[PDB]
Design a protein around this ligand. Structure first.
Ligand SMILES: *[C@@H]1O[C@H](CO)[C@@H](O)[C@H](O)[C@H]1NC(C)=O
Length: 115
Protein backbone atom coordinates (compact mmCIF):
# COMPACT_ATOMS: atom_id res chain seq x y z
CA UNK A 1 0.00 0.00 0.00
CA UNK A 2 1.35 3.37 1.12
CA UNK A 3 -0.23 3.54 4.57
CA UNK A 4 1.81 0.44 5.38
CA UNK A 5 4.90 1.73 3.59
CA UNK A 6 4.89 5.04 5.49
CA UNK A 7 4.60 3.07 8.73
CA UNK A 8 7.59 0.81 7.98
CA UNK A 9 9.62 3.91 7.01
CA UNK A 10 9.54 4.84 10.69
CA UNK A 11 11.71 1.83 11.56
CA UNK A 12 15.11 2.92 12.96
CA UNK A 13 17.44 0.00 13.64
CA UNK A 14 20.84 -1.45 12.83
CA UNK A 15 19.59 -5.05 12.64
CA UNK A 16 16.77 -6.10 10.30
CA UNK A 17 13.38 -6.42 12.02
CA UNK A 18 12.92 -10.17 12.73
CA UNK A 19 9.24 -9.93 13.77
CA UNK A 20 6.24 -9.51 11.48
CA UNK A 21 5.75 -5.97 10.21
CA UNK A 22 2.15 -6.39 8.96
CA UNK A 23 -0.68 -7.90 11.03
CA UNK A 24 -4.13 -8.47 9.51
CA UNK A 25 -6.98 -9.54 11.81
CA UNK A 26 -10.77 -9.81 11.68
CA UNK A 27 -12.62 -7.39 13.95
CA UNK A 28 -13.55 -8.63 17.45
CA UNK A 29 -10.71 -11.19 17.33
CA UNK A 30 -7.37 -10.98 19.17
CA UNK A 31 -4.32 -9.41 17.53
CA UNK A 32 -0.69 -9.99 18.49
CA UNK A 33 2.20 -7.62 17.76
CA UNK A 34 5.64 -9.09 18.42
CA UNK A 35 8.78 -7.10 19.16
CA UNK A 36 12.29 -8.60 19.19
CA UNK A 37 14.46 -7.21 21.99
CA UNK A 38 18.29 -6.94 21.53
CA UNK A 39 19.71 -9.07 24.39
CA UNK A 40 22.89 -6.96 24.73
CA UNK A 41 21.08 -3.65 25.28
CA UNK A 42 18.74 -2.06 27.76
CA UNK A 43 15.80 -4.48 27.51
CA UNK A 44 13.02 -1.86 28.07
CA UNK A 45 10.30 -1.64 25.39
CA UNK A 46 7.29 0.65 25.03
CA UNK A 47 4.35 0.41 22.63
CA UNK A 48 3.14 3.53 20.84
CA UNK A 49 0.03 4.12 18.75
CA UNK A 50 1.10 6.49 15.98
CA UNK A 51 -2.38 7.78 15.11
CA UNK A 52 -2.71 9.75 18.36
CA UNK A 53 0.75 9.26 19.89
CA UNK A 54 -0.66 7.23 22.78
CA UNK A 55 1.85 5.46 24.99
CA UNK A 56 0.06 2.13 25.46
CA UNK A 57 2.57 0.16 27.55
CA UNK A 58 6.13 0.91 28.68
CA UNK A 59 7.51 -2.48 29.69
CA UNK A 60 5.60 -5.01 31.77
CA UNK A 61 3.00 -2.32 32.72
CA UNK A 62 0.01 -0.88 30.84
CA UNK A 63 -0.60 2.86 30.43
CA UNK A 64 -3.76 2.94 28.36
CA UNK A 65 -7.03 2.54 30.24
CA UNK A 66 -8.61 0.48 27.42
CA UNK A 67 -8.52 -2.98 29.05
CA UNK A 68 -8.24 -4.78 25.71
CA UNK A 69 -4.44 -4.16 25.69
CA UNK A 70 -1.90 -6.32 27.52
CA UNK A 71 1.86 -6.80 27.21
CA UNK A 72 3.51 -10.15 27.90
CA UNK A 73 6.85 -11.95 27.61
CA UNK A 74 6.50 -14.67 24.98
CA UNK A 75 10.21 -15.59 25.09
CA UNK A 76 13.50 -14.22 26.42
CA UNK A 77 13.83 -11.89 23.41
CA UNK A 78 10.22 -11.44 22.22
CA UNK A 79 7.58 -9.19 23.79
CA UNK A 80 3.92 -9.38 22.76
CA UNK A 81 1.33 -6.60 22.74
CA UNK A 82 -2.06 -8.32 22.99
CA UNK A 83 -5.10 -6.47 21.62
CA UNK A 84 -7.94 -8.50 23.08
CA UNK A 85 -10.74 -7.42 20.71
CA UNK A 86 -9.60 -5.58 17.59
CA UNK A 87 -11.90 -3.00 15.99
CA UNK A 88 -11.71 -1.20 12.67
CA UNK A 89 -10.61 1.84 14.70
CA UNK A 90 -7.57 -0.14 15.91
CA UNK A 91 -6.05 -0.46 12.43
CA UNK A 92 -2.95 1.65 11.89
CA UNK A 93 0.72 1.96 12.76
CA UNK A 94 2.30 0.89 16.06
CA UNK A 95 5.85 1.52 17.29
CA UNK A 96 8.00 -0.72 19.50
CA UNK A 97 10.84 1.44 20.88
CA UNK A 98 13.77 0.00 22.84
CA UNK A 99 15.81 2.18 25.18
CA UNK A 100 19.05 0.70 23.83
CA UNK A 101 22.10 2.87 23.17
CA UNK A 102 21.02 3.53 19.56
CA UNK A 103 17.28 4.13 20.16
CA UNK A 104 16.06 1.21 18.09
CA UNK A 105 12.50 1.57 16.77
CA UNK A 106 10.45 -1.15 15.07
CA UNK A 107 7.25 -0.59 13.10
CA UNK A 108 4.17 -2.84 12.98
CA UNK A 109 1.09 -2.09 10.90
CA UNK A 110 -2.16 -3.53 12.24
CA UNK A 111 -5.05 -3.90 9.79
CA UNK A 112 -8.41 -4.93 11.22
CA UNK A 113 -11.07 -6.20 8.82
CA UNK A 114 -14.78 -5.99 9.64
CA UNK A 115 -17.15 -8.23 7.56
C1 LIG B 1 8.25 -9.08 32.91
O1 LIG B 1 7.26 -10.09 33.18
C2 LIG B 1 7.82 -11.39 33.45
C3 LIG B 1 6.66 -12.37 33.46
O2 LIG B 1 6.39 -12.80 32.13
C4 LIG B 1 8.60 -11.33 34.76
O3 LIG B 1 9.16 -12.61 34.99
C5 LIG B 1 9.73 -10.33 34.59
O4 LIG B 1 10.45 -10.14 35.80
C6 LIG B 1 9.22 -8.95 34.11
N1 LIG B 1 10.36 -8.13 33.75
C7 LIG B 1 10.46 -6.82 33.98
C8 LIG B 1 11.73 -6.16 33.54
O5 LIG B 1 9.57 -6.18 34.51
Amino acid sequence: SEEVMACLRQERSRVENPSQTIVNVVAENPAYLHCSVPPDAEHEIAWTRVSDGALLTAGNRTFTRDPRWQVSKKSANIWVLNLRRAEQQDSGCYLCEINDKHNTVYAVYLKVLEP
